[PDB]
Amino acid sequence: PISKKRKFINDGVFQAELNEFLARILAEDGYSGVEVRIRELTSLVQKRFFLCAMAQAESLRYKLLKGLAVRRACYGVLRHIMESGAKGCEVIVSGKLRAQRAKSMKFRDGYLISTGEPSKRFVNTATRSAQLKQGVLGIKVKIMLPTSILPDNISVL
Amino acid sequence: VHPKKYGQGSRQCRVCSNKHAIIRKYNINICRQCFRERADIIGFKKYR
Amino acid sequence: KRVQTFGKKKTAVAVATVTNGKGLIKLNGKNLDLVEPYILKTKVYEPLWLIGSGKLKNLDIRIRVKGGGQTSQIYAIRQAIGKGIISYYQKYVDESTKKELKDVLLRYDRSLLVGDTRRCEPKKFGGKGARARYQKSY
Amino acid sequence: DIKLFKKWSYEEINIADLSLVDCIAVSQKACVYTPHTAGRYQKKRFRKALCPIVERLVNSMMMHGRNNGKKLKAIRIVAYAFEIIHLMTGENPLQVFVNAVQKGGPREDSTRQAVDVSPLRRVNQAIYLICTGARNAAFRNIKSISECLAEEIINCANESSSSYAIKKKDEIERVAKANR
Amino acid sequence: IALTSKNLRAIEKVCSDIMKGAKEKNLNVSGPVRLPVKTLRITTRKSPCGEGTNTWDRFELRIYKRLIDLYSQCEVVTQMTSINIDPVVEVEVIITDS
Amino acid sequence: YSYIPKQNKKLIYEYLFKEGVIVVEKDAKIPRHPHLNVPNLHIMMTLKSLKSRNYVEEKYNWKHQYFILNNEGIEYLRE
Amino acid sequence: RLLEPVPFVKTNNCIKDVDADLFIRSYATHLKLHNKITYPKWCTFVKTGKGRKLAPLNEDWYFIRASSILRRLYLHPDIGVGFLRRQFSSKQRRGVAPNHTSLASGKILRSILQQLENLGYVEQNPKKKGRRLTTKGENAINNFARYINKKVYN
Amino acid sequence: RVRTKTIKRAARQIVEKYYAKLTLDFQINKKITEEVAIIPSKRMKNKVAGFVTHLMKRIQKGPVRGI
Amino acid sequence: KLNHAVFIVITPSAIAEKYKVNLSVARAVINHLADSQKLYT
RNA sequence: GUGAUGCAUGGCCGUUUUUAGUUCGUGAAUGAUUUGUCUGGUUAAUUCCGAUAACGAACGAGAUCUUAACCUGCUAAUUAGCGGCGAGUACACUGUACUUGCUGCUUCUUAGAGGAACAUUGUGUGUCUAACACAAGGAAGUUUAAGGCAACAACAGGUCUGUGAUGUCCUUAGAUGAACUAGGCUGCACGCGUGCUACACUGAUAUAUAUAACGAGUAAAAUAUGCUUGCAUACUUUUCCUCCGCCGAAAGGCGUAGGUAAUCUUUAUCAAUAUAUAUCGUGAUGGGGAUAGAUUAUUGCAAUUAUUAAUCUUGAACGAGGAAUGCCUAGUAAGCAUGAUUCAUCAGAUUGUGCUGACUACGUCCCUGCCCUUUGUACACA
């Protein structure tokens, strides 16, 4: 019998709950939906309350926690997202990087729109961490879904 | 102990587990620190 | 017969209804005289000089005025009564003199027929003011 | 038709220099019973001059310390002041007003070499100088600011040395005699 | 019969769902209700540490309500809603008589 | 003191056999557990000791634990 | 001076048509003559408002406060002690700390309303929870309004 | 204020397709621009049309660089 | 400082100029002859 | 582990930096490199026009949307109404303020939706190109204004005291974990900020009408019994804002209406600058309040370090301001309040909102600080 305005914060925070649940757990596959294997999570959440950019982002952490070459790993991912159909791509791996000095490099292709409400509604980003031998290496990735139509797309037969 | 249901001790942020900079707006019960990165998923759409 | 008209200008929105009668005008339970400012009373009086009390002597214009600034009440009510008299001239009483009625209002000004859309803004970050910053030190 | 404070309609004015006329801008569109209309100036170069000189004082004499930001009382003081002008003197308050604003502006000032003043600043410094005469004639002067006004506008409009504005005008002109 | 949500398109589609069944069934149906939207907004500082310029961000949630009434059978309307409602939308039921 | 009863340990030992998934919370000051008429303070020490024995695993989270019971777990604590 | 020409059709059927502050002044005038009420001997030692910080210095503050409260009754047939306190709110200066708006003193208005109830000009009732004029109060204040209207019209 | 090359080239690409359908009327030339184009922002949908009209007021007076 | 006194065109300001009096007693003398500030007759 | 290391790191953020800048494919000109990316014109902007060993691209800029506005006599009325008559309480005479109740009706109180603003039309400047002007309709002509997103590269900027984000080093029974008693950041020659309160009659003071918006709001009392006020066990929900009717000058206290909320505070209305007349009529003055002891009630178990708070006593500086120095062009500065956060109690802090709608600029490179071109460098930690 709580207020609906209070209930909105409630289901927002609960949704963020299950979000961090599935982000903490999901590393062996992609996303197969959410329910409104399966048995453990269904029981856990119940007793608790009683071609994807994200997939490629997690594939990045999976490719580099094991010590595979950073450069070749990034190149493999920038092939993966085009062959899946990503319009462009971007990836940053910043941190200790084998040297006592932080360093960051970029691997960009395509447009990579970066400012605006139509920018945010189309660009797809993700960030991750990778605990390493002598520090942690931050990952950022960006994938664009090809164009609802873009504001700057004009064409007449 | 000296527990009571009053003051800054009876509640705290539910992820950092700290009593500093906790916001209870609409009983959200979170700290500004972790909240600023959960803002989008929860639904807080930075608009204007 | 009966027409209900509205006036939106600044905070205050005036509502009036032009009805059949002899010239009974009512502002809440108040008349056009006890609002306080005799300065704005004559501002509302200006149309009655523009048109005439003789024509007002054959129709009733009730008014409800509620909320908003003192200036906005009067500025909304003048537009509301102008729209009401225009609607009555269009619908029931007479059209040819309505043609000249619009002309004599517009000759005095366009402000009566339609007001302004000036309004305040969301104050910006940086200090107490919208466009003023906290004093800086070096 | 209209009546300023239910009294005045300023149907006769002085010629002055005929140039300050466009700046003072007394006309039917600017006719009003009391100042402090919703007039706006933040679009162009004229409507600041379009605004009636009566408003140009009710908004300009206002500043002194705490007394800042009180304008309804500025309309109050000008309304009373106009009473005392036509009472202590036999001429129209607004006419001697126009006389004062006309003959209370600096005809030139060097300001980096002397330079003539546009009619806008001619009216501007006249208003400013009479209002800053009002403030120091209301501070430590025994008499109240209302009678101070009744003294200063006549002092400036009849060329009497008692007005602060005319002394400051003489000082401001005197710089020409040294530079130009 | 009132609806609750935050993104207007959800209420728009689930509200277009409403009157078609009433027109089909020729029921005694009351008119719609179009309430002003509620806006929930909070302000929070950026910059986890105190260093640098103090900067803040403002948030916004738009909350959308409408109310309907129908002199139709409670079970049939409940099912004809549950068939085509989204869990992201909340519904309450009430009846009329005339 | 804080002596842990054998009967308390056994009651908790069946409370997780009957289900297979448990949440115990880091905070031990709550007077009661939603599905346990037990004082909680005596249960996370033992669950953590069991996790230190490589029989039950915890993926961990913020203000939650979310332990899981392994294939080799119903056998060792049965008796 | 306070009169201006009226070319529009009036009613003059009640009190809201006539002036307010001068009407309550004339009501205080009739109230001195008829003196159905007391001063009272209790208001003289307590200031009207918390933030007033001054004595009223009128020998008629209570007398015009009752008049104003009656005018507020006439306007709003549903008001309470909180309503009158808010209607009488005044500034308060806290010395080195900033000014703040704070309400009036409850007991003065409570005594005024109890005196009005004794006078019978107003009454209470569950429905219409605020103060509601009696029909006798309506007729008395309406004939008072008509008398006030005529004495200034002619 | 000027105008951006995106809208300039979007204004140039049209006209050449159905000049037999474009006519003198400003409102008609406005309407046909959205009728034929694909722009999703209405501010463009009239902003480019403004420049298109600005271009056709250069015809029957000299060379207009294209068409 | 104050030196004016009630002891001895009914305009308050003009009569105050003519007789060097306080404004309260100036309105007092105004009342004495005729029988915030007002518009004049 | 809020122990060291932010000069070992992640992420975030703050700065260069809200400017106009950055890069690539191919081509052309021992090399670093250059061109493209520009003499000029224009501009919010490498924004465009144009010239052009460059041609063609990508980012950045541009843009999108909310707030205000007009319509869509669309769409409709909850918690908004409009009526109409049902009886009137008092008047007019051949309708009215205050009331009860429903339904002919939705521009009105409103949002679902889109539309409308497009140098728009003509009279002008401009290589007649880019652009810029007047007048006008129109609510909307400075992109209708105001809000956010910030490329490349960098700082050895801040943070490992935010995190079970984290490397390395360092420590745990005489802890570097937790709890409990008391204390401190409120202590003070001073200095600098952010601010809070006067120097009055443009004001000091008492009465009241005409006042809006963003607003925000629900594992514990008490009673009974037993033992002898305290403990244990049982029953409603007090534990939000509050309206009302009472008590107390007040603070505050009592019992209840409403509401998880366009429904109750409250909204046919919540503050202040008001108002018109009234006391004063610039006399360190009655201005103004740095300053006191005496206390009364609330807040929390605890108010001493007078938390907060009602009254009486108080009477420093203050005559518009040292050298210096900050911010600021439209319903904005400023004045005035006020909402919200941190909240058991506490703005003198921070973030929003509204009222009064001020003096003047269709600008300049003088200071300061940026951007570009050329030029000189013995500078490159620049």
State the CATH number of the domain containing residue C18: 3.30.230.10
- Mutation pick from H39, H42, H43 vs chain A, by most beta carbons of A within 10 Å, is H39
Residue G74 CB neighbour total at 10 angstroms: 21
Taking contacts as CB-CB distances below 8 angstroms, the residues of chain D near C71 are 38
Query: Who's near C28: CB < 8 A, 6+ residues apart?
Result: C63, C64, C65, C66, G16
Q: Are strands C59-66 and C25-27 parallel, antiparallel or unpaired?
A: parallel
User: Encoding tokens for residue E58?
Assistant: 């403002």
Per-residue DSSP letters for chain G?
-------SB----SSTTS-SHHHHHHHHHHHHHH--S---TTGGGS-S-TTT-S---SS-HHHHHHHHHHHHHHH-SS--HHHHHHHT-EEEEETTEEEEEE---HHHHHHHHHHHHHHTSEE--SSS-S-EE-HHHHHHHHHHHHHHHHHHH-
| CATH code that applies to domain D1-180 | 1.10.455.10
Instruction: Output the CA–CA distances (angstroms, integers) from residue F55 to A82, D8, E70, F7, F74, in the order listed.
Output: 44, 100, 59, 22, 9
Taking contacts as CB-CB distances below 8 angstroms, the residues of chain B near A6 are 26-27
State how far the Cα of A156 lies from the Cα of H49, in Å rounded to an integer.
Answer: 14
Phi then psi for G98, rounded to 5 degrees?
A: -70, 160
State how far the Cα of C135 lies from the Cα of F59, in Å rounded to an integer.
Answer: 51
DSSP lists the bridge partners of residue E90 as E4
Give the burial class of A91: count Cβ atoms within 10 A of its Cβ; 0-12 exposed, 13-18 middle, 19 or more buried.
Answer: buried
Q: Please tell me if residue E61 touches chain A, with a CB cutoff of 8 Å.
A: yes
- Contact indicator for C69, C10 with CB cutoff of 8 Å: yes
CB atoms F63 and B17 under 8 Å: yes
Domains and CATH numbers, chain E: 1-98 (3.30.70.600)
Q: What is the DSSP letter of F13?
A: H
Query: Who's near G78: CB < 8 A, 6+ residues apart?
Result: G128, G129, G130, G131, G132
User: Encoding tokens for residue C136?
Assistant: 């800086």
User: Encoding tokens for residue F8?
Assistant: 């308390």
State how far the Cα of A144 lies from the Cα of D39, in Å rounded to an integer.
Answer: 52
Burial B6-31 (b: 16+ CB within 10 A, else e): eeeeeebbbbbeeeebbbeebebbbb
State how far the Cα of H29 lies from the Cα of H54, in Å rounded to an integer.
Answer: 11
Of all residues in chain G, the one with the smallest CA distance to C26 is G10
Positions of E strands within H1-67: none
User: Encoding tokens for residue H58?
Assistant: 């250069």
- How big is chain G by its Cα radius of gyration, in Å? 17
Query: Who's near C12: CB < 8 A, 6+ residues apart?
Result: C65, C66, C67, C68, C69, C72, C73, C75, C76
DSSP lists the bridge partners of residue C17 as C4, C62
Phi then psi for A139, rounded to 5 degrees?
A: -115, 135
Taking contacts as CB-CB distances below 8 angstroms, the residues of chain C near G74 are none
Query: Who's near I33: CB < 8 A, 6+ residues apart?
Result: I10
State how far the Cα of A74 lies from the Cα of A57, in Å rounded to an integer.
Answer: 11
DSSP lists the bridge partners of residue C30 as C27
Burial C87-122 (b: 16+ CB within 10 A, else e): ebbeeeeeeeebeebeeebeeeeeebeebeeeeeee
State how far the Cα of G6 lies from the Cα of D15, in Å rounded to an integer.
Answer: 40
State how far the Cα of G139 lies from the Cα of G35, in Å rounded to an integer.
Answer: 20
The torsion region of residue D65 among left (phi > 0), alpha (psi -120 to 50) and beta comes to left
Q: What is the DSSP letter of B17?
A: -
Calculate the CA dihedral of residues E49, E50, E56, E59 and round it to 10 degrees.
Answer: 40
DSSP lists the bridge partners of residue G46 as none
Among E36, E14, E18, E4, which residue's Cα sits nearest to residue E72?
A: E18
Within a 13 Å sphere around the CA of A18, how many CA atoms are in the beta-carbon half?
A: 16
| Vertex C35: Cα angle to C31 and C38 (nearest 5) | 100
Residue A11 CB neighbour total at 10 angstroms: 15
Query: Who's near F42: CB < 8 A, 6+ residues apart?
Result: F2, F4, F8, F12
CB of E92 nearer than 7 A to strand J: no
Q: Tokens 């039917």 belong to which residue?
A: D28
State how far the Cα of D130 lies from the Cα of D138, in Å rounded to an integer.
Answer: 12
Taking contacts as CB-CB distances below 8 angstroms, the residues of chain A near H17 are 156-157
Among F61, F64, F70, F60, which residue's Cα sits nearest to residue F23?
A: F64
Residue H50 CB neighbour total at 10 angstroms: 16
Instruction: Output the CA–CA distances (angstroms, integers) from residue A13 to B14, B24, C44, D109, H12, in the order listed.
Output: 11, 13, 56, 69, 51
Among D9, D46, D45, D1, which residue's Cα sits nearest to residue D26?
A: D9
CB atoms B15 and F63 under 8 Å: yes
Strand, coil or helix: what is D90? coil
Which helix (H) or strand (E) element contains residue A24? Answer: helix A4-25
Query: Who's near A125: CB < 8 A, 6+ residues apart?
Result: A53, A140, A141, A142, A143
Q: Tokens 């600011």 belong to which residue?
A: D145
Q: Are strands E38-40 and E61-67 parallel, antiparallel or unpaired?
A: antiparallel
Q: Is residue B34 marked as binding?
A: yes
- Smallest CA–CA distance, residue G120 to chain C, in Å, is 24
- Contact indicator for E97, E36 with CB cutoff of 8 Å: no
State how far the Cα of G125 lies from the Cα of G127, in Å rounded to an integer.
Answer: 6
Of all residues in chain A, the one with the smallest CA distance to F20 is A40
- Contact indicator for G39, G62 with CB cutoff of 8 Å: yes
State how far the Cα of F69 lies from the Cα of F22, in Å rounded to an integer.
Answer: 8
The torsion region of residue A46 among left (phi > 0), alpha (psi -120 to 50) and beta comes to alpha
State how far the Cα of F3 lies from the Cα of C127, in Å rounded to an integer.
Answer: 60
Calculate the CA dihedral of residues D105, D108, D110, D111 and round it to 10 degrees.
Answer: 40
CB atoms A151 and H39 under 8 Å: yes
State how far the Cα of E34 lies from the Cα of E64, in Å rounded to an integer.
Answer: 9
Residue type, G21: D
| CATH code that applies to domain H1-60 | 1.10.60.20
| CATH code that applies to domain G1-154 | 1.10.10.10
- Contact indicator for C44, C78 with CB cutoff of 8 Å: yes
- Mutation pick from C18, C34, C60 vs chain G, by most beta carbons of G within 10 Å, is C34
- Mutation pick from E7, E38, E44, E58 vs chain B, by most beta carbons of B within 10 Å, is E44
Instruction: Output the CA–CA distances (angstroms, integers) from residue C79 to C7, C13, G54, in the order listed.
Output: 5, 10, 45
> In the 3-class helix/strand/coil scheme, how is D92-116 assigned residue by residue?
CHHHHHHHHHHHCCCCEECCCCCEE
Chains touching C, CB cut-off 8 Å, 3+ pairs? D, G
Among F28, F71, F29, which residue's Cα sits nearest to residue F47?
A: F28
Burial G112-141 (b: 16+ CB within 10 A, else e): bbebbeeeebbeeeeeeeebbbeeebeeeb
- Contact indicator for E29, C98 with CB cutoff of 8 Å: no
State how far the Cα of H2 lies from the Cα of H4, in Å rounded to an integer.
Answer: 7
Positions of E strands within F1-79: 21-22, 56-58, 67-69
Taking contacts as CB-CB distances below 8 angstroms, the residues of chain A near F35 are 47
- Smallest CA–CA distance, residue D81 to chain C, in Å, is 19
Q: Tokens 């404070």 belong to which residue?
A: D5
- Contact indicator for H15, H53 with CB cutoff of 8 Å: no
Domain count, chain C: 1
State how far the Cα of B33 lies from the Cα of F56, in Å rounded to an integer.
Answer: 33
Give the burial class of A153: count Cβ atoms within 10 A of its Cβ; 0-12 exposed, 13-18 middle, 19 or more buried.
Answer: exposed
- Contact indicator for A141, A84 with CB cutoff of 8 Å: no
**Which of the nucleotides lies closest to I23 (Cα–C1')?**
J281
Residue type, E95: I
Give the burial class of I34: count Cβ atoms within 10 A of its Cβ; 0-12 exposed, 13-18 middle, 19 or more buried.
Answer: exposed
| Vertex I22: Cα angle to I20 and I26 (nearest 5) | 85
The verdict on domain B1-48 having CATH code 4.10.830.10 is: yes
Percent helix, strand, coil in chain B, to 5, is 30, 10, 60
Among D39, D11, D19, D13, which residue's Cα sits nearest to residue D119?
A: D19
Bond into G40 cis (ω within 30): yes
C-alpha H20: how far from its chain's center?
A: 14
Chain J footprint positions (protein CB, under 7 Å): 2, 8-15, 42-45, 47-50, 58-70, 73, 75-79, 82-84, 89-91, 95-100, 107-121, 128-132, 137-140, 142-154, 156-159, 162-168, 179-181, 192-203, 205-220, 242-252, 260-262, 265-266, 268-284, 289-291, 300-301, 309-312, 319-321, 325-338, 340-345, 347-348, 350-362
Domain count, chain F: 1
State how far the Cα of G63 lies from the Cα of G51, in Å rounded to an integer.
Answer: 20
Among D123, D125, D101, D100, which residue's Cα sits nearest to residue D111?
A: D125
- Smallest CA–CA distance, residue D68 to chain I, in Å, is 22
Strand, coil or helix: what is D73? helix
- Contact indicator for D143, I17 with CB cutoff of 8 Å: no
- Contact indicator for G111, G40 with CB cutoff of 8 Å: yes
Q: Is residue B15 marked as binding?
A: no
State how far the Cα of D149 lies from the Cα of F32, in Å rounded to an integer.
Answer: 81
Instruction: Output the CA–CA distances (angstroms, integers) from residue B10 to B3, B6, B13, B34, F27, in the order listed.
Output: 8, 6, 11, 19, 13
Domain boundaries, chain G: 1-154
Q: Are strands E43-45 and F21-22 parallel, antiparallel or unpaired?
A: unpaired
State how far the Cα of H27 lies from the Cα of H19, in Å rounded to an integer.
Answer: 16
State how far the Cα of H3 lies from the Cα of H11, in Å rounded to an integer.
Answer: 11
State how far the Cα of D175 lies from the Cα of C10, in Å rounded to an integer.
Answer: 50
Domain boundaries, chain I: 1-41
Per-residue DSSP letters for D125-156?
HHHHHHHHHHHHHHSS-SS-HHHHHHHHHHHH
